[PDB]
Design a binder for these strands. Structure first.
Ligand SMILES: [Zn+2]
Length: 133
RNA sequence: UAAUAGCUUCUUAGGAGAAUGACGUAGCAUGCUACGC
């Protein structure tokens, strides 16, 4: 889309030296101790986002056993029989956090709050009915 | 640049409800006293 490739990196974490000093003053992080730091913020170079996406090379076209899958579907539907569902109106949709990204290209002009405010319920129902045809 | 969903903690604001207390007004019940018949 642009005239140059973007290489997004990942920063390292920020070290809470006060908590670490307090912990080691209490006898933590000793040699041979059972509790040791194993969870960190790992930094990434510019070739990270394209190296993770390349893992979609593990998705192969798999043809399933259809006489078996069509029975597994019935059993799974039996597993999902206690619930109820169906279409709701735009005034019945509850969004948890509206200060979230709206994806491309909509993140160039605002968050999801902008598009949930700018669209009335009428033209949200219109969009939903558009997606059914 | 920062997704979907769930749960939880904390803070603030608004409404509704409950409980207790306080004041004021109105209605009803009772006792005492003053006047008239
Ligand atoms: Zn439907």
């Amino acid at each position: 889309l642009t005239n140059n490739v973007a290489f997004q990196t990942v920063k390292p974490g920020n070290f809470n030296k006060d908590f670490y000093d307090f912990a080691v003053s209490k006898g933590f992080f000793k040699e041979g101790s059972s509790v040791e730091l194993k969870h960190f913020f790992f930094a990434q170079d510019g070739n990270a986002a394209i190296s993770d996406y390349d893992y979609y090379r593990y998705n192969l076209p798999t043809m399933c056993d259809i006489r078996q899958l069509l029975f597994v579907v019935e059993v799974v539907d039996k597993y999902f029989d206690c619930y109820d569902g169906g279409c709701i109106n735009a005034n019945q949709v509850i969004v948890n956090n509206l200060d979230k990204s709206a994806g491309f290209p909509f993140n160039k002009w605002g968050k999801a709050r902008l598009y949930y405010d700018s669209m009335s319920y009428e033209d949200q129902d219109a969009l939903f009915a558009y997606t059914k045809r």
